[PDB]
């Protein structure tokens, strides 16, 4: 979904 947001 995102590069590193989780």
């Amino acid at each position, epitope marked *: 979904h*995102h*590069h*590193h*947001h989780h």
Partner: antibody
């Protein structure tokens, strides 16, 4: 040069719904998520959520679940936030920001949403 | 759920003075697989949107002068201006850029005194 241009209605009655628009130019729209940020008059900053344009996947701050809906139109490089059941507490400037690997490195100018009480 | 705290709230300044704002997170912003603290700093002037100064705790964006240095790790971070100039009189925010939900500090305002 990168640009995110914001449009939308400014003045709304309580109980209205408003669809804010964010038009992205100067970069591959699908290569970055899009964040939405609320800044109230207290200058408090609150992240509302993001959308991935490639998949239409969203993540919401629980505080704004239902209150905000996030859509994109990939064809026109445009992201949308729909604010629903507007209360005076929803009065703020709303920003879209581009969010890839380096946080929110470009911001729209902001759409001021005023809800008369 | 991560909470950001900055200090001080306000800060008087002067020509060429060095300033230091603190940012402390309730939980580590350290992504160990990425080997990266995912903390970001923004500068906001009245009328304008916030502007990214630093991402990943220490990385200055293009057009950000060397005078701005971010440092820290885990849960404790600082933003330092070696020689304050007039254009730096703004509000500064740090941001959890690490875990959903993304959260912001309340800010640190560089109000000049006199």
């Amino acid at each position: 040069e990168v640009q995110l241009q914001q449009f939308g209605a400014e003045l709304v009655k309580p109980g209205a719904s408003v669809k804010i628009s964010c038009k992205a130019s100067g970069y591959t729209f699908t290569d970055y998520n899009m964040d939405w940020v609320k800044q109230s008059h207290g200058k408090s900053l609150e992240w509302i959520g993001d959308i991935n344009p490639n998949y239409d996947s969203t993540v919401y701050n629980q505080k704004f679940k239902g209150k905000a809906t996030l859509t994109v139109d990939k064809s026109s490089s445009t992201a949308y936030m729909e604010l629903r059941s507007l209360t005076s507490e929803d009065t703020a400037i709303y920003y879209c920001a581009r969010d890839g690997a380096y946080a929110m490195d470009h911001w729209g100018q902001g759409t001021s949403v005023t809800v008369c009480s | 759920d991560i909470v950001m705290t900055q200090s001080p709230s306000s800060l008087s300044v002067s020509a060429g003075e060095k300033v230091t704002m603190s940012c402390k997170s309730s939980q580590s912003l350290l992504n160990s697989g990425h080997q990266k603290n995912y903390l970001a700093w923004y500068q906001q002037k009245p009328g304008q949107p916030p502007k990214l100064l630093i991402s990943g705790a220490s990385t200055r964006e293009s057009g950000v002068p060397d005078r701005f240095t971010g440092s820290g790790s885990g849960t404790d971070f600082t933003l330092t201006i070696s020689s304050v100039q007039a254009e730096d009189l703004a509000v500064y925010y740090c941001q959890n850029d690490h875990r959903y939900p993304l959260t912001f500090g309340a800010g640190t305002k560089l109000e000049l005194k006199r």
